[PDB]
Write a protein that binds this DNA or RNA. Structure first.
Ligand code: MG
Ligand code: MG
Ligand code: MG
Ligand code: MG
Ligand code: MG
Ligand code: MG
Ligand code: MG
Ligand code: MG
Ligand code: MG
Lengths: 124, 208, 99, 150, 83, 138
RNA sequence: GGAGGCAGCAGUUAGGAAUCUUCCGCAAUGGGCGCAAGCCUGACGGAGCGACGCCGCUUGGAGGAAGAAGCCCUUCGGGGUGUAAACUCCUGAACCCGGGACGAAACCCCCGACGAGGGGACUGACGGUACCGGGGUAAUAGCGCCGGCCAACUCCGUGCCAGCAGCCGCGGUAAUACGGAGGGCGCGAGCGUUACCCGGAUUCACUGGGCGUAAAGGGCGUGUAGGCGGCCUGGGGCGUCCCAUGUGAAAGA
């Protein structure tokens, strides 16, 4: 634009989009598993992926990935939702925080232990 | 902080002989002499040519390891140097070298910089007559750095000040072996320290 | 000091009041161009002495009504119906912006 | 005994009846760290000949860098294609503040302290070529006074 | 009324006051009319009580009351002695 | 009808220099001359002279170049590598003395209109005055 | 018929991913009342809890093998962990003993005049705390990452499963990308994660971008407001520039 145009109409400041109505802009959210179930990924990948539909304190029911080999979530398990999507399950915008509320840690886990909510194993 | 854990193992990896044990890292032993390759299952394999990052990471790490200083303390020390007047590289060394734990090593009251830390920290050092136990303490031009009167005749201190009869202490300093006193005269010039460290690459590390 | 402003009389439809239009110019805070904005001031004229086209110093004052906080200081020059016509064209053009 | 720094290796491909067919391209900077630098882009059916040729062409395309205590006489912005390099002298202690491509180029020229921005298209090649064009256009106070006399 | 009094600065276990003149109704640490001295009750430095006497006198003469504790400190720097 | 005669003058210089003209003509103004006075004084141009094309005042400006050069492309280097209007009718640029620019780190010149005349950055700074940033040259 | 209004300090309860003691003391500073003594002061000064944040400090130091064992790799000679340990000396966090603050000199009292000025008395929550002296024990280490960006690689298990994932994408039976081991890199009483802001983003571009074909010239005139306006001389001095001066509180920088 000419400077006069810029005077008259100016520049539109960007404005940008949450990936994550964990409402409020909370960093986490309590919810209850409504359904726990397995789903299949989008074309390139193939798996039986573990997700829970989750009804939230935030007023919203959404799906959420259950990370870790193995889990203990069932129909009313309480859960901490985390944010983070999965490039592979469409409309899974959130993860479940293992190690919190009714989400158990991941058993036998020994490497990336603090994700996966796993207590430091005893070196008896 | 001060790391705590195997040293003449980064006397290696940096691939260049720091002096973390003082006395042994002079014997046919600093492993630079024996095993001048990085630690671990690899180490003696084909060196892959370093990324521009690794070049600088290593240079930064080299310098830091030399003084036994936490990265948080180091970056701070560095950011202070940058704001300070004139050449950030040179100045930054001078600030590292102004440290009490290191001044004490440069005086040879202690063999290694680790040791100097432990001495300072245990009340054995005194600056201008009052006792200081803060390794990080900043030493200023004109300060008397002595050995505490009660500590004066300790096995380790006599050994160490016995070896200082003979030696020349770096030009920016004075030493009084008989009376166990030292004087920080001025800040170290960039050349007064023959450091195995291109400090200009360290500035560049912090530019990212 | 009491703020003095000068500008033209663009209305004298009121009793003992003239509407006085003040142009002013500032650099744009970001883009720097000198811009020209304008404000109208109701100005006390207790002796209905000022007429349309009069260019007048306006001076800050003890409130005289809601809106009126400026008396007419003096008459810089007279019959500038060109500046009056300008403002009225700007005003009449509004009739052609609605639905 | 110029130094040499290997800036870019890539493998291009072209097409033939039933086949992709490859070729390599190497961008190599060559320089003494004392005001002389070279850029060369070499291609060959295998990597080391490409690097080799690059080396050759660089030593054959070199430049007057007018250093001044490890920095540069004055600002320059060069556009090369849709790539842009901005170059700003700096006092000592600054370091060479630059992307990997123009860093290499400036280090081997013997630049110690300088500030830079890659703008526009970051394509390493056109950035390289523009860094070079920038330095090729630097002038010293002396170069300038000489140009204007009587 | 207006006051000559100690505004607390410094830090925890580090009292360092400013001798300041201020409406009585301000909060203690609030806005003040003018600074005149400073005071360090622990004399950690030799220049631990300072006062600008010629100003304190202006303020006393236009009806500022000093705090007991402030008075003591102006007295000590001879705001009150008159030869 | 020419919106910016100064700009047009600078542009006549740049256009001429890029084809290595001996000289060029620019319709005359006192202000234009004062700019040229400086270009000359700083050695970007050999100098100018008033003249009269078809009954009308121009300033014929005499361009200056470097030596002819070696290799493919022997075109002289420009003395005027760059000449750019700053202040312009659509956005006037004004700067006081303490924020006058240093152009190309000293090797360039800025030019401004001041209440003491048309000065360079160096003249102005040493006179203590700001003004309109007419243009920068290097 | 009455009573009530913690968005005062604490605290409860609910909501929440989540945020403290129903603490000590008016000794200080400040406030209200009083001639004063003094009363009141959840302002305040302190203590407590929380790695929430920042700064500082410790978990040893010097010696110690062509190099134990274990464990990992192995081309079955070795190689790695590693001077790391064991081991010898040395020092002595914590502890325990003794001593022990500054912060507090006024108000008041007496001489002087109930002024200035000189002299006297009381007063400490924090706190038996800080700190000083004397004894004195080798005394917590973990977290993330090692496909590229990005610093750091081998073996086993697995076989589009389990799983990883910020993007490219990894996983189909030799996977440096899954899981574990050893090894490494990076930080270190922390290390990661998620959320949000700026950066990178010259990707709203004043600095500092664009529209033939990438997104972008209005289908074309006419024209209102508006924006912009050739050459010369004078007056004004609004823009503009200069100087002085006031203001730009404190804190922060
Ligand atoms: Mg992982
Ligand atoms: Mg781009
Ligand atoms: Mg709840
Ligand atoms: Mg931006
Ligand atoms: Mg664009
Ligand atoms: Mg198309
Ligand atoms: Mg198009
Ligand atoms: Mg068209
Ligand atoms: Mg018009």
């Amino acid at each position: 634009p000419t400077i006069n145009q810029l005077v008259r109409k100016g520049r539109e400041k960007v404005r940008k989009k949450s990936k994550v109505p964990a409402l409020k802009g909370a960093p986490f959210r309590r919810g209850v598993c409504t359904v726990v179930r397995t789903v299949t990924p989008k074309k390139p990948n193939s798996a039986l992926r573990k997700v829970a539909k989750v009804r939230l304190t935030s007023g919203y029911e959404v799906t959420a990935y259950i990370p870790g080999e193995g889990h203990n979530l069932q129909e009313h398990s309480v859960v901490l939702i985390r944010g983070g999507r999965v490039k592979d399950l469409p409309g899974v915008r959130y993860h479940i925080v293992r190690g919190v509320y009714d989400a158990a840690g991941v058993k036998d886990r020994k490497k990336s232990r603090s994700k996966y909510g796993t207590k430091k194993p005893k070196e008896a | 902080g001060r790391y705590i854990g195997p040293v003449c193992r980064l006397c290696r990896r940096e691939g260049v002989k720091l002096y973390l044990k003082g006395e042994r890292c002079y014997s046919p032993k600093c492993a630079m002499e024996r095993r001048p390759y990085p630690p671990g299952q690899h180490g003696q394999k084909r060196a892959r040519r370093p990324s521009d990052y690794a070049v600088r990471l290593r240079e930064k790490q080299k310098l830091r390891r030399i003084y036994g200083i936490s990265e948080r303390q180091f970056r701070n020390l560095f950011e202070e140097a940058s704001k300070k007047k004139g050449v950030t590289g040179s100045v930054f060394l001078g600030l590292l070298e102004s440290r009490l734990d290191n001044v004490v090593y440069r005086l040879g009251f202690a063999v290694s910089r680790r040791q100097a830390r432990q001495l300072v920290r245990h009340g054995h050092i005194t600056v201008n007559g009052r006792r200081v136990d803060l390794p990080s303490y900043r030493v200023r031009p004109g300060d008397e750095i002595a050995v505490a009167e009660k500590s004066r005749n300790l096995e380790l201190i006599r050994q160490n000040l016995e070896a200082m009869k003979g030696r020349k202490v770096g030009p920016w300093l004075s030493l009084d072996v008989e009376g166990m006193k030292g004087k920080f005269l001025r800040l170290p010039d960039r050349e007064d320290l023959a450091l195995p460290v291109n400090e200009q690459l360290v500035i560049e590390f912090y530019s990212r | 000091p009491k703020k003095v402003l000068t500008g033209v009389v663009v209305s004298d439809k009121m009793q003992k009041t003239v509407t006085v239009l003040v142009e002013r110019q500032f650099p744009h805070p970001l883009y720097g161009k000198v811009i020209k904005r304008s404000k109208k001031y109701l100005a006390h004229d207790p002796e209905e002495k000022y007429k349309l086209g009069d260019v007048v110093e306006i001076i800050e004052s003890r409130p005289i009504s809601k809106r009126k906080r400026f008396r007419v200081l003096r008459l810089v020059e007279s019959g500038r119906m060109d500046l009056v016509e300008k403002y009225l064209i700007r005003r009449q053009n509004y009739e052609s912006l609605s639905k | 005994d110029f130094e040499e720094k290997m800036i870019l290796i890539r493998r291009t491909a072209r097409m033939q009846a039933g086949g992709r067919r490859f070729r390599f391209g190497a961008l190599v900077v060559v320089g003494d760290r004392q005001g002389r630098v070279g850029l060369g882009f070499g291609k060959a059916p295998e990597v080391p000949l490409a690097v080799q040729k690059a080396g050759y062409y660089a030593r054959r395309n070199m430049v007057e860098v007018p250093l001044q205590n490890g920095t540069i006489p004055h600002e320059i912005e060069v556009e090369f294609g849709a790539s842009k390099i901005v170059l700003k002298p700096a006092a000592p202690g600054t370091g060479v503040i630059a992307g990997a491509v123009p860093r290499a180029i400036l280090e081997l020229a013997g630049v110690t302290d300088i500030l830079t921005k890659e703008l526009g298209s970051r394509n390493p090649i056109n950035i390289a070529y523009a860094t070079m064009e920038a330095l090729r256009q630097l002038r010293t106070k002396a170069d300038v006074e000489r140009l204007r006399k009587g | 009324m207006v006051k000559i009094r100690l505004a607390r600065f410094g830090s925890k276990h580090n009292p360092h006051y400013r001798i300041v003149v201020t409406d009585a109704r301000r909060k203690r640490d609030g806005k003040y009319i003018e600074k005149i001295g400073y005071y360090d009750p622990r004399k950690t430095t030799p220049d631990w009580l300072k006062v600008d006497v010629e100003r304190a006198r202006y303020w006393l003469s236009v009806g500022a009351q000093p705090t007991d504790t402030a008075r003591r400190l102006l007295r000590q720097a001879g705001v009150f002695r008159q030869e | 009808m020419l919106t910016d005669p100064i700009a047009d003058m600078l542009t006549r210089i740049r256009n001429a220099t890029r084809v290595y003209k001996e000289s060029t003509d620019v319709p005359a103004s006192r202000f234009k001359e004062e700019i040229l006075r400086i270009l000359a004084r700083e050695g970007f141009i050999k100098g100018y002279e008033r003249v009269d094309v078809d009954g009308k005042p121009y300033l014929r400006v005499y361009l200056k170049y470097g030596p002819r050069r070696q290799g493919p492309d022997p075109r002289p280097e420009q003395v005027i590598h760059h000449i750019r209007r700053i202040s312009k009718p659509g956005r006037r640029v004004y700067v006081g003395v303490k924020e006058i620019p240093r152009v190309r780190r000293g090797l360039g010149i800025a030019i401004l209109s001041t209440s003491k005349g048309v000065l360079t950055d160096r003249e102005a700074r040493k006179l203590g005055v700001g003004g309109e940033l007419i243009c920068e040259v290097w």
